[PDB]
C-alpha cells in the first residue's frame, strides 16, 4: 500500500527479485537546467519505526 | 516596440531606463546594455 | 518556488472517498461540496493520516 | 596500502553540476551535494559531492583535493573545507566523492572550500535529525552511559561489498573555444579534444573535427560547440547529460559503508 | 528503506526520443519536449523551442 | 538534384544535397522527414 | 561601495573618531543563528539571506579589530503557498511572492 | 595591582586530562571542559578548563 | 590459529585482510599492521 509496511518487499536480503510501489512520479525540469526531479511518498518502513 | 525617450530597448520588447545601462548588472537576457561595444570597455 | 506534496492514495466506496495522505511538511487540505451548501472543511496535516 | 582503495578512484575525474543556492542564485558549482545520507544513530552523516578528495594528478595525498574550473582539472591543498548544518560540524574523513561528518540537527547541508580568494559554496535542503539510541531522548552523546548496539557509518575506507558505477562522460558544451579568425569563426581544439560542432548559418554543417577546421560562416552565435574527453570517467549523476552510444558499467566502491557498533 | 537511483538523462535536443520498458521495480519513463537547457559555458544546443 | 556520386539528395522538394553518412542520426536536418527513415536495423 | 575618492564595490568607509577611515571589505559577516550569505551592499544598506532567529548581528574587520553590533530583532521564515517548508526547494511550483530587489536603483 | 591577583597562580600549571569529542574519538587534550556554570540571568556563563590564560 | 590466505593475522587470534595493511589505520589492537617490520617507514 506504498506507505505502511510493504513499500519494499524482498524474499531474502541478497535476493534479486524486488517488489516496489512507492508512487514514483516524474516531474518536468524547469527554467533550462539538466536535472531529474521526482515526487514519491516516503518509506513506510521508516514510518513503521 | 518603440519605447520612450528615457527607456533603452535591449531586444524583442524589453525596455529598461537609461540609468540601467552600463552599470555592472545584466538586466536583459540579450546582455546588450553591458556588451563590449555598447559599454565601450 | 514552493514545494509539492506527494500524491494521495484514493480509495472509493459507496458515497465515500477515502484519502491516505503521507506528507513531509505540514500541509493544508480544504474540501467543499458543489451543492446548495458547500459544508467546508479545513485542516493542517502534519502526520500520515486517513480521512473519509 | 592507500593505492589498493585508490586504484579505481584514479580512473575518474571531478565534474561541474547544478547546485541550488550555490551563492544566492543557483549557479553551477565545482562541488555539488548529491545524496546525503542521514540515518545513523549518533548524528553522523555521509555526504557525496562532485569534487575529489585525497587524490592529486600523480599519486595520492590525504591533504590535497582536486576540482574543475572549466575543462582544466585543478588540484589545490585542502585548507578550510567546512561542513555545517546549523552549527559547524566536525568532519571525520574524506575519500573520493564522499565526505563524512558528525552534524547537529537542522534543515540545510552546506559545504565549501577556499582556494585563493574564492568561496565555492553549495547548500542543499535536507532534513537531518539526531537519532538517540534506546529509551531516552538525549540531545548529545554523553560522557558515561550504558552501551547499546547502534548502527553507524564506519571510519575506514575499504571495498566492503558495496559498489557504485562510473560512466564515460557525455558531450560537454564549451563556448570559449569558438572565436572569429578574421571574419569567419575558427575552432580551437586542444590536445586531442575531438571537438564537435553544429552550424545552422545557411543550413546544417555538422561534423566532428580533431584540429583547426576554420568554419566558413560568419557569427559565433549561430554555431554550437562541444568537447569529447574520454580519458577519465564520471559517476552517472542525474544532473549530467548521458553519452550517445552504449556506456560501460563501471564499478566503484563506497568507502564509508554502514556497520554495527556500540553507542 | 529504499533508495531511488536516477540514471543520467539523454539530451537528443533536435528531434525526439522514446524508451522501451526495462524490467526494473517501479520503473518510470517520460519525455519532456522543448526544454532548452543551460549548462556551464553556454546553452547546450542550438535548436530552440 | 544531379549531385556528385558520393552524396544523396534529400526531400526532393527544394533539391538540397547531403552526404550519405547522415542516416537515422536522430536530427531533423531537411524540411521533409525522409532522412530519418529507412535506416539499418 | 565608497572609498572617499570615487566608487568601488570592494571598498567601505567608516569613522573612528573624527577621521573618516576607508578600508577594503575583507570579512563582512552577517549572522542570525547561522552565518547568512549576503547578496549586495549599497551605501547604508546590506541585503542578506538569513535563517530564522532572534538576533541580527553584522561586523567587519578593520585591522586586527572586530567591530561587532548585535541587535535583538525576531526574524522568521515565510513560505509561499499551502505547505510550510523550512528551506526553498530545488523543484516544485512557481508561485508569486514579494522579495527585496537585487538591483540598486 | 594586577600582580596581586596572580600570586598563587604562578605556582600552578596546565595539565592534560581527557574530554570527549575533540574530533570524533574522545581525545586527551590540553583543553578539558570541567564544571560549566550557567546560573546567571543573561546567558553569561563561566567555563573552567585545564589551560592557563 | 590460522586464518585464510587473504587475511593478515596480527596477534590474539584477530586477523584483517591483506588489503588493510600498511594504510595508516589501526585495524588491530596491537598496531602490527603499521609497524616498522612491514611498512618499513
Ligand atoms: Ca544594467
Ligand atoms: Ca540525418
Ligand atoms: Ca591498517
Of residues D45, D55, D149, the one with CA closest to residue D103: D45
Cell 544531379 sits on residue: F2
**D246 in a domain, yes or no?**
no
Task: Tell me the C-alpha distance between D229 and D200, whole Å.
Answer: 25
Residues D84 and D184 reside in one and the same domain: no
**Residue at grid coordinates 596572580:** H6
Same domain flag for D40 and D81: yes
Query: Distance, CA G95 to ligand 1 centroid (Å)?
Result: 26
Please state, as a whole number, how many other Cβ atoms lie within 10 Å of the Cβ of residue D48.
18
Residues D53 and D114 in one domain: yes
F37 touches chain E (CB under 8 A): no
> DSSP labels for D199-226?
EBSSSB--EE-SS------S-GGGEEE-
D108 domain-assigned: yes
CB within 8 Å of D100: residues ≥ 6 apart? D44, D45, D46, D47, D91, D92, D93, D94, D153, D155, D256
Q: Using CA coordinates, name the residue in chain B closest to G9.
A: B24
Experimental method: cryo-EM
Asked if residue D135 and residue D62 are part of one domain, the reply reads yes
Contacts B24 to G, Cβ<8 Å: 9
Pairing of strands D252-253, D223-225: unpaired
Q: Is residue D244 part of a domain?
A: no
Which residue in chain E is spatially nearest to A43 when comparing CA positions? E1
Work out the burial of residue B6: count CB atoms within 10 Å of its CB; fewer than 13 is exposed, 13-18 middle, 19 or more buried.
Answer: exposed
Instruction: Indicate the SS3 state at residue B38.
Output: helix
D34, D161: one domain? yes
- In the stretch 27-46 of chain A, residues with CB closer than 8 A to chain E read 28-29, 32-34, 36, 38, 40, 43, 45-46
Taking the C-alpha atoms of residue E37 and residue E43, their distance in angstroms, rounded to an integer, is 6
Distance I40 CA to ligand 3 centre (A): 14
Residues D132 and D156 in one domain: yes
Residue D242 lies in a domain: no
User: Domain with D188 in it: what CATH number?
Assistant: 2.60.40.4310
Per the domain annotation, does D29 fall within a domain?
yes
C-alpha cell, C37: 451548501
CA–CA separation, E28 vs E1, rounded Å? 19
Chains C and G touch (3+ CB pairs under 8 A): yes
Q: Which residue of A has its CA nearest to D26?
A: A33
Residue in this structure with the C-alpha cell 600523480, named with its chain if needed = D58
Which residue is associated with the grid cell 559554496?
D121
Task: Give the DSSP letter string of chain C.
Answer: -B--PPPPEEEEETTEEEEEE--SS-EEEEE--SSSS---EEEEE-S-EEE-
Nearest beta carbon to residue D143 from set H20, H23, H24: H20
Length of chain A: 49
Residue D223 cell numbers, joined: 554555431
Which ligand does the CA of I39 lie closest to?
A: 3
Domains of chain C: 2-52 (2.60.40.2400)
Q: How far is the CA of I20 from the centre of ligand 1 (A)?
A: 59
Measuring CA to CA, which residue among D257, D45, D28, D30 is closest to residue D164?
Answer: D257
Tell whether D228 is covered by a domain: yes
Pairwise CA distance, residues H42 & C31, whole Å: 48
- Enter the C-alpha cell of residue D68: 574543475
**Structural contact between residues I27 and D6, judged by C-beta atoms closer than 8 angstroms:** no
CA distance D31 to D25: 15
* D123 and D152 belong to one structural domain: yes
Residues D75 and D205 in one domain: no
Buried b (16+ CB within 10 A) or exposed e, G44-56: eeeebbbbebeeb
Q: Which residues pair with G70 in a beta bridge?
A: G57
Q: How far apart are CA D154 and CA D256, in angstroms?
A: 5
Q: Calculate Rg over the CA atoms of chain H.
A: 14
At F14, give phi and psi (nearest 5°).
Answer: -105, 0
Spatial separation of the C-alpha atoms in residues A6 and A16, rounded to whole Å: 17
Q: Is E25 exposed, middle or buried (0-12, 13-18, 19+ CB in 10 A)?
A: middle
For chain I, the farthest-separated pair of C-alpha atoms sits apart, in whole angstroms, at: 29
Q: Are D91 and D176 members of one domain?
A: no
Eight-class DSSP state of G83: B
In a domain, D226, yes or no: yes
Identify the chains in contact with H, defined as 3+ C-beta pairs within 8 A.
Answer: D
Which residues have C-beta within 8 Å of that of residue A9, sequence separation ≥ 6? Answer: A18, A19, A20
In whole angstroms, give the CA distance from residue F23 to residue E10. Answer: 20
Same domain (yes/no): D115, D215: no
Q: How many CB atoms lie within 10 A of CB I16?
A: 18
Instruction: Please report, in angstroms and rounded to a whole number, the separation of the first and last CA atoms in chain I.
Output: 29
CA distances from G9 to A35, D119, G20, G68 (A): 34, 18, 18, 21
Closest CA to G54 of G31, G36, G37, G38: G31
What is the CB-side half-sphere exposure of residue C10 using CA atoms within 13 A? 4
Residue G6 neighbours by CB distance under 10 Å: 8
Distance I8 CA to ligand 3 centre (A): 10
Q: Does residue D243 fall inside a structural domain?
A: no
Q: Which residues pair with D153 in a beta bridge?
A: D258
Picking from D80, D256, D242, the residue whose alpha carbon sits closest to that of residue D171 is D242
The answer to whether residues D63 and D181 belong to one domain is no
Chains G and B, touching by 3 or more CB pairs within 8 angstroms = yes
Q: What is the CATH number of the domain that holds D115?
A: 2.60.40.3200
Tell me the residue range of the domain where D149 lies: 2-168+251-263
CA pseudo-torsion sign D251, D256, D260, E2: negative
SS3 call for I14: strand
| Nine-digit cell string for E49 | 523551442
d(CA I30, CA I15): 11
Cβ neighbours of D45 (radius 10 Å): 23
Q: What is the CA radius of gyration of chain D?
A: 22
- Say how many domains are in chain D: 2
What residues of A are in contact with residue C48 (Cβ under 8 Å)? 3, 47
Q: Beta strand D196-199 with D207-208: parallel, antiparallel or unpaired?
A: antiparallel
Chain G positions contacting chain B at CB under 8 Å are 9, 103, 105
Burial letters for D117-147: b for 16+ Cβ neighbours within 10 Å, e otherwise? eeebbbbbbbebebbbbeeeeeeebeeeeee
C2 chain-G contacts, CB cut-off 8 A: 79-81, 83, 85, 89, 92-95
Report which of D195, D29, D39 is spatially closest to residue D115, judged by C-alpha positions.
D29
Take residue F33 and report the three cell numbers written for it: 522527414
Q: Within this chain, do residues D45 and D89 fall inside the same structural domain, yes or no? A: yes
Amino acid at each position: 500500500k506504498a506507505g505502511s509496511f510493504g513499500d519494499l518487499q524482498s524474499r531474502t536480503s541478497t535476493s534479486n527479485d524486488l517488489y516496489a510501489n512507492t508512487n514514483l512520479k516524474l516531474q518536468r525540469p524547469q527554467a533550462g537546467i539538466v536535472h531529474t526531479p521526482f515526487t514519491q511518498v516516503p518509506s513506510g518502513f521508516e514510518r513503521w519505526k | 516596440p518603440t519605447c520612450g525617450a528615457h527607456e533603452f530597448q535591449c531586444s524583442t520588447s524589453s525596455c529598461i531606463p537609461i540609468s540601467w545601462v552600463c552599470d555592472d548588472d545584466a538586466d536583459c537576457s540579450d546582455q546588450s546594455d553591458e556588451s563590449l561595444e555598447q559599454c565601450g570597455r | 518556488i514552493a514545494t509539492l506534496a506527494p500524491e494521495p492514495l484514493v480509495e472509493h466506496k459507496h458515497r465515500t472517498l477515502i484519502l491516505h495522505l503521507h506528507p513531509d511538511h505540514p500541509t493544508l487540505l480544504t474540501t467543499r461540496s458543489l451543492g446548495s451548501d458547500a459544508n467546508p472543511t479545513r485542516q493542517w496535516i502534519e502526520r500520515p493520516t486517513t480521512v473519509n | 596500502d592507500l593505492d589498493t582503495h585508490f586504484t579505481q578512484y584514479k580512473l575518474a575525474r571531478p565534474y561541474i553540476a547544478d547546485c541550488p543556492n550555490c551563492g544566492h542564485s543557483r549557479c553551477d558549482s565545482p562541488i555539488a551535494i548529491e545524496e546525503v545520507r542521514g540515518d545513523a544513530h549518533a548524528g553522523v552523516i555521509r555526504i557525496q559531492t562532485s569534487a575529489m578528495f585525497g587524490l592529486k594528478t600523480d599519486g595520492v595525498d590525504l591533504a590535497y583535493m582536486s576540482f574543475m574550473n572549466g575543462k582544466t582539472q585543478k588540484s589545490i591543498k585542502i585548507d578550510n573545507l567546512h561542513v555545517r548544518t546549523s552549527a559547524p560540524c566536525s568532519l571525520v574523513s574524506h575519500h573520493g566523492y564522499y565526505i563524512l561528518a558528525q552534524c547537529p540537527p537542522g534543515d540545510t547541508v552546506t559545504v565549501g572550500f577556499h582556494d585563493g580568494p574564492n568561496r565555492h559554496t553549495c547548500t542543499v535542503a535536507h532534513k537531518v535529525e539526531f537519532r538517540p539510541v534506546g529509551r531516552e531522548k538525549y540531545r548529545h552523546p554523553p560522557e558515561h552511559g550504558v552501551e547499546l548496539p547502534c548502527n553507524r557509518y564506519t571510519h575506514k575506507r575499504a571495498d566492503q561489498g558495496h559498489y557504485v558505477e562510473m560512466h564515460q562522460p557525455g558531450l560537454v558544451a564549451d563556448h570559449s573555444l569558438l572565436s572569429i579568425h578574421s571574419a569567419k569563426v575558427k575552432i580551437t581544439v586542444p590536445s586531442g579534444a575531438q571537438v564537435k560542432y553544429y552550424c545552422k548559418c545557411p543550413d546544417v554543417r555538422k561534423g566532428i573535427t580533431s584540429s583547426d577546421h576554420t568554419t566558413t560562416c560568419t557569427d559565433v552565435k549561430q554555431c554550437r560547440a562541444y568537447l569529447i574527453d574520454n580519458k577519465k570517467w564520471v559517476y552517472n549523476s542525474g544532473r549530467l547529460p548521458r553519452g550517445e552510444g552504449d556506456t560501460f558499467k563501471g564499478k566503484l566502491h563506497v568507502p564509508f559503508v554502514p556497520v554495527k557498533a556500540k553507542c | 528503506k529504499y533508495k531511488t537511483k536516477v540514471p543520467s538523462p539523454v539530451v537528443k535536443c533536435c528531434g525526439a526520443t522514446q524508451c522501451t520498458s526495462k524490467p526494473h521495480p517501479d520503473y518510470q519513463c517520460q519525455v519532456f519536449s522543448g526544454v532548452y537547457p543551460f549548462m556551464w559555458g553556454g546553452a547546450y544546443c542550438f535548436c530552440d523551442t | 538534384r544531379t549531385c556528385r556520386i558520393h552524396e544523396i539528395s534529400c526531400g526532393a522538394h527544394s533539391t538540397q544535397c547531403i552526404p550519405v553518412s547522415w542516416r537515422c542520426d536522430g536530427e531533423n536536418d531537411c524540411d521533409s522527414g525522409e532522412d530519418e527513415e529507412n535506416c539499418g536495423n
